[model samples]
Target chain A: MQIGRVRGTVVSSQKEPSMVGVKFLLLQLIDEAGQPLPQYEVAADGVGAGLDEWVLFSRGSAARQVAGSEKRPVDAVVIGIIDTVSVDNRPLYSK
Target chain B: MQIGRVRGTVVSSQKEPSMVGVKFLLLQLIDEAGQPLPQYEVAADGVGAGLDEWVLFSRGSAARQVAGSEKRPVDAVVIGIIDTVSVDNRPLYSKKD
Candidate 1:
């Protein structure tokens, strides 16, 4: 899992019917320091994450399995909201 | 999942028939602007993604699923040939390379 920020929402009127109620958002991967990981993309699931909120993301097989999209085609998925993160045993940010 | 260049090809005579005809190539990940994205490895499926060509890739379970290799152990898979990618709104390069 990686830390990121909720930048914006993706609105797709036409998509797989099974994905009707799922919310997708644009996420910018950020490091522990809250800086960009040099990538950005639209991903599935909001899970109550808001703009600029510290968030956790799961990619790859873990992402698919976590969202229960095992038989469906899906990529990135947000798994958790971070209450705190520490680096070198130092608290960087807390919510 | 990422962009990379086809550096070379991998030939393994002893392998699965489903992947027998597939060509594996060494790939170096690069950014949307054609800069290295800090990752590299060999990937299956050439699709004419030649050396120095900006290519898009899929990784993890999606990668395995895309290549129809489900129930098989495989990671990264080359899915699309990138026509273009821009950062901060700037054109990078074309197939002329």
Candidate 2:
């Protein structure tokens, strides 16, 4: 799983019908200091996450475990919304 | 699904038996302008994409939906060969004969 911030949304009208209801969110990978990195990824939303919220995302088949993602052509999925993060007993971020 | 161009092949002689007969190809992500980006990924081949050929790929468990990939540990799969790509009413890429 990777840490990211929901940055935006992806709109695709000509996509496969199998992906009709899936929500795609643009994500910006974030560091421990809460700084967004240059790397950006589009992930399917498993949990209802709002813009600028920190999220946990998983890639690969693990993403399929989320509801509504089974057998779908998805590569990444937002699995959880983060409330706080800590490193070495020091708080890194809090929602 | 994402768009990429197959750049090379990945050879792994020692792997899970369930992954046998699966071909892994190196792919470079491409922009709508047909420009290759620095991002790269390795995806299992389902449609036998050739080197330098643009392809559409699916990731996650969706990759498992491919024939022979079900239940395997693959995370990415090449789903289709793209013959042409159009953006903003302009042709970006077309497979040459």
Candidate 3:
């Protein structure tokens, strides 16, 4: 799994037929330093992540690891909302 | 799909039981500008790629995209050998270049 911060939402009516009703979020991926990268992904939301929330997500075909999405072309998906982050015995972030 | 250049091979006698006899290769992943990245992965070789060859690979669950390996815990796999890479209509690289 990877970590990212939800930056915004995406709306679509003309999308893959299998992804009906699925919500998408714009994410800025987090790096080893716990800082957001310039890179971004439009990720399918499976865990109801709110804006600016740090979330864990799956990439590539693992995005389809969720039930009933085995056939979707989803390459990224939000899987969990993070509550806190710590490194080197130091608290770096908290929800 | 992603691209990488095979750097070397890996030997394993002790590993996940499902990966017996599976050949692993060290790959330096390629970037959009047709350059190799510093990061690497010991990717399972499914396409018989040799050292120094640029190959296409899949990551995460897509590594198990190959037949009969659906249940394996593989996170990376070489799927195809590359021919050439053209960027902005420029011949950036080629197997024969």
Candidate 4:
């Protein structure tokens, strides 16, 4: 899973039926230092999140198996909602 | 099996119990030179891909097959789209000219 900030959401009409209820969100990838990179985009399911919220989203194959998306053609999914981030015994993101 | 460029689309109805329907696009990850990376991304589906377009994707024990996406988990997915890349014989992204 990679750390990112919820930048926005995506609403598609001509999409897959399985994706009918899922929420696609825009994620801004951030490094360990919390620096946002140039690359950014939308993904499937926001995991009950809102804008500017820090999240840990899974990529690759791991993204397809998020509890409810099994067998679905899904590549991006928000698996966990981060409450706090501690590194080197330091708090990076606090709930 | 990578290095493919989809010039297409996939329409599915009876998807996994989890996924009802999702648009799956065939992807072929390429290298810095615009050469097909050989490795590709065919996870859940296309992230709005068109023919002859360049894309970046991931793989691993991760490639669900895009395959079966079993046990309710996915591995390969298109995390980002590359707008511009600069790779030298050993491209140094850290140094800008």
Candidate 5:
């Protein structure tokens, strides 16, 4: 799983039918050291993660492991909302 | 799925049990326009792709869709060998033709 900060919602009207009713959120990926990447990725959200919240996300078929996500072309999904990411016994990230 | 060029083999004596008996190949990824990326990726090969050949690969669980790959941490797999990719009716890559 990778960490990401939710930016905002991603709404599309003419999308794949399989994607209908699925919530999409824009996210800025955070490296293991908590540094954010310049590029962004959109992920399907089912956990109701709020904006600016750090969350755990998984890619590709792992995302499909979620119920109702099977058969969809979902590349990523918000799996959990994180409060902190401690590394080396130090709180690298804490809400 | 994405396009990549087979580079060479990736041999590891100590590996995950699920990865044992699987063929691993090094690949240099190619963008939509045929430009090569600087980074490299390793993918499991079941299609018998040869070195320097362009092949199609898919990531993550999509790779698990292949038989015998399920339950493995296979991030990518060489699913098919590419012949040519033409854009605007012009072949961007041709195999010795």
Candidate 6:
């Protein structure tokens, strides 16, 4: 799993029927230092993540196993909303 | 999913039982321009992708769903064979005739 921040949302009018009920969010990949990177991914919302919230996501087939994303075409899914982050015994981010 | 080209193969004589029947291919990430990048991955073969073929692959746990890769330790899997790639109405790559 990877950590990221929900940067935005995606509104698709037409897509696979199995994907109709899922929420899509733009994820800005962040390094362990909590610094964002240029790379980003559009991820399925498995945890009802709010904008700007830090999240834990899984990519590839593991995405489908998150919440109601099963059997869907999503390649990335936000599986958890982060409340805090720590590195080397030091708090890196909180909420 | 991302796009890459199969550059080589992986020979892992020791692996998890669930991965017994899968073939692992070495993938080199490519840009929209079809040029190879510095990044690479070892991807499970779901579609019998050939060497040097451009393929569409998924990463993370989704890789486990590819064919016989389920419940395996794989993190990447090739899912499709790309015959052509276009960008902005321009043809970037097409399988050699």
DockQ for every prediction shown: 0.15, 0.14, 0.07, 0.06, 0.06, 0.10
Q: Give per-candidate clash totals.
A: 1, 1, 0, 24, 0, 4
After superposition, candidate 6 runs with Cα above 4 Å error: A1-69, A72-95
lDDT of 5 by residue, B8-95 (tens): 9999989888888989999998754567788678988877888888765556665665667668888777656666655334566666
**TM-score per candidate, chains pooled:** 0.58, 0.60, 0.53, 0.51, 0.52, 0.55
lDDT of 1 by residue, B30-91 (tens): 74335676578777663566777655555666655643566556666665555544333344
- Score candidate 6 by TM-score against the native: 0.55
Give the Cα lDDT of each candidate: 0.63, 0.74, 0.70, 0.54, 0.71, 0.69
Please list the residue runs of candidate 2 whose C-alpha ends up more than 4 Å from where it truly belongs after superposition.
B1-36, B39-57, B66-97
Ten contiguous residues minimizing lDDT sum, candidate 1 chain A: A10-19
Q: What share of the true interface contacts does each candidate keep?
A: 0.11, 0.23, 0.08, 0.08, 0.08, 0.12
Model 4 - which docking category?
Answer: incorrect
Candidate 5 chain A worst ten-residue window by lDDT: A9-18
Model 1 regions more than 4 Å off: A5-28, A37-56, A65-75, A78-95, B16-18, B37-39, B92-97
> Candidate 3 local accuracy as lDDT?
0.70
Q: Write the per-residue lDDT of candidate 1 for residues A1-95, one digit (tens) a residue.
A: 77877765544332333345655555778887788777764456747877777778777666567545664335677888888898799999788
Put down candidate 2 lDDT per residue, B24-81, tens digits, no spaces.
Answer: 9999997544678999989988566888887767766777775566789988877567
Models ranked on TM-score: 2, 1, 6, 3, 5, 4
Any idea what lDDT model 6 has? 0.69
Colliding residue pairs in candidate 5: none
Q: Best DockQ goes to which candidate?
A: 1
Q: Between which residue pairs do clashes occur in model 2?
A: A60-B60
Q: Which of 1 and 6 is ahead in DockQ?
A: 1
lDDT of 5: 0.71
Tell me the tens digit of each residue's lDDT in model 6 across A3-48. 8877665443323344567665657789766787856666777568
Per-residue lDDT over A65-90 for candidate 4, one digit per residue giving the tens place of the 0 to 100 score: 77666644455678777788889999
